[PDB]
């Protein structure tokens, strides 16, 4: 851009700053700020009363709702006015209050978003996390900095995620929980600190997992968490595993990002 | 209406789409968006920077704080834009980012609040609710889909009601609790999951039950909580309870609503 | 003042009520409304969308974001529009959605902040608190009516400090907590309700306290909680070992202040 398409409608009260770049049918509501280094996709609205600033690229057919706050300065102690980033994907549904924040240049100048999100009344994103599709952050879920929140992943009402974690697709965490350490993909965690609770079968019934394949997921947390062998131990039972079950090649994946240790 | 009273204020700064029926006295103040399906009665304030929208019936008397988000789109996966309904009674105080979502077409269609509550900070009012009157909801309160709260129930700071269940009346919930399952009236419910404590006795003496209401109810707890029986072998005995002692019946009341089974 | 300062800019769309005092080199953002017994001191900065109002004095440098409420009505059940006070002092970070309310009359009054604080988004200070300088409040971190936070002190994400506690200086709160009595200084308190977990060492080295210090408070806090004896024993060795070590003396003037017992 640095422009404003013809067909894009923004509010007589909206502030858009020159520079702005605003897509085809997208809507900028009444009292909308929106910063000079934004960049709003096609069919994008914000509702109303909604802050987008800083270098920000938000995708297309999202919808932003009252009083969230996008691309924010972040709470990064650290933090003393970089140029840093936000890049937010399409169709995600934000809703009232949530806030995302740009990233930090320590923690490598970015916090991302996916596709086909959920982020519920007062979710927070914090400097330098990934989020990637079809996530839900309950309401008031909170992600401290660097975390990743993976494919399908669903983060319960109330629950705090601890700076650095890692949580692995398909992955749910109850409500009122505080995770303090990295959560492999396909598990059930809760508690404060939360602790493994089996399979999340419910979530890969829906999304149309077969019936070897959530064995076969079934037998790699075994592996993990019943067994009674190292960690260590496992890692080439899990990939000999994985060599007939291609979905168990996601515990390998995961391992080889995280850094907390599992929770246990 | 669809008319704004002579005697009602709209600040110029003030959006009230045409429609909205706004009552004698009423304030609207600045930066406030109220749809045409709006209605707000006699007396009622909206301080500042409030939405409300939606097919939304407002009573008297009320004080609505800037931030909060009233009759908005609600959180549930299916709901697809259905002309559903809020209603709200008279007298609340509304506080800073309250969120009360509108009704879903599978339950129900309304989310219904009465009068004379107190809804704290940032509380949350999901689709499908029914608060009664007299009510607390302290800050970062949340009531998932098709939540009841009876009268004079407190649902304590940082505390999730878990979807469907029923908080009886006189109530008392402690913070940071999770209710996963119904609580019957004039119970203190903690935890997570949250756990029966005893009667809410002092609730009950400062609202005038007499000391033999309170001890036929304390009867009723025990019978429920300490006897040993299955709730089926004491439903009989508490109705039985409750020829002498009125305020018993609430619990037989309850007990006819209740689908999650009781918090033990 | 009240006037605004002529190096004071104030956005067309804010309004700032005859009688309001903006110091030199002050902003106030689009869609802010301050009310007419507010002080704002040089350099402070108001983002966008700021409310404050009552008798509300706020100092120098300090940045307030969007959605923030300052010096609002009290959530207190006995209020009724007294002009009670709030006093905000240098250098803070108010992140968006903090709400700081005015004080109560029975409360004392006065609800006051320090100085060069971080109060993250969405915490709360409620009617009649004192929070001192260099303090942490987390995400959606909540004081009660008539709450100290002494100097140095962090309190978590998600946690609730209840009414008339004390947190004493350099204290660490973990996240998710509820903390129900008062806390020494130099303490780590965490879980619900809250339980002390030694001294806060690593806090107390990064902000410059010396071996001997450090091993002095260790060991006052070991005649408090490992051993054996009551309060009213050991209140008179710790103010013996602060004879030596000055730093110790922390305890014994927060013994003085201390109403509720101490976390155990």
Redesign the interface.
């Known amino acids: 851009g640095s422009m404003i398409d013809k067909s894009a409608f923004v509010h007589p ?1 909206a ?1 858009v700053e020159e520079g702005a770049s605003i897509g085809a049918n997208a809507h900028i509501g ?2 909308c ?1 929106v910063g000079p280094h934004v960049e709003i996709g096609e069919g994008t609205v914000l ?3 909604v ?1 987008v600033n800083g270098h920000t690229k938000i995708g297309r057919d999202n919808e932003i ?3 969230a ?1 996008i691309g ?2 972040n ?1 990064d ?1 650290k933090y003393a006015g970089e140029p840093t980033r936000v890049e937010i994907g399409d169709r995600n549904r934000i ?3 949530v ?1 995302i924040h740009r990233g930090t240049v320590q923690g490598g100048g970015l916090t991302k978003v996916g596709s086909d999100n ?1 982020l ?3 979710a ?1 994103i914090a400097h330098d996390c990934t989020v990637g599709n079809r996530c839900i952050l309950a ?2 879920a ?1 992600l ?1 900095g660097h975390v990743s929140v993976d494919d399908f992943a669903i983060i319960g ?2 629950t ?1 995620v ?1 700076q650095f974690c890692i949580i692995g697709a398909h992955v749910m965490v109850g ?4 995770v303090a350490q990295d959560v492999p993909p396909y598990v059930i965690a809760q508690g ?1 600190h939360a602790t493994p609770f089996g399979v999340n079968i419910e979530g890969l019934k829906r999304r149309g997992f077969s019936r070897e394949a959530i064995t076969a997921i079934r037998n790699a947390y075994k592996l993990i968490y019943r067994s009674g062998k190292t960690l260590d131990e496992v890692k080439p039972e899990i990939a000999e595993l994985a060599e007939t079950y291609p979905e168990v090649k996601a515990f390998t994946d995961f391992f080889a990002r995280s850094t907390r240790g599992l929770i246990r």
Do not use: D
């Open positions: 009260t502030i009444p009292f700020i509702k109303s009363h802050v709702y009252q009083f706050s924010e300065v709470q102690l809703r009232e209050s806030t959920l519920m009344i007062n927070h309401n008031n909170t401290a009402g109330m705090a601890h409500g009122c929980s505080g404060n």
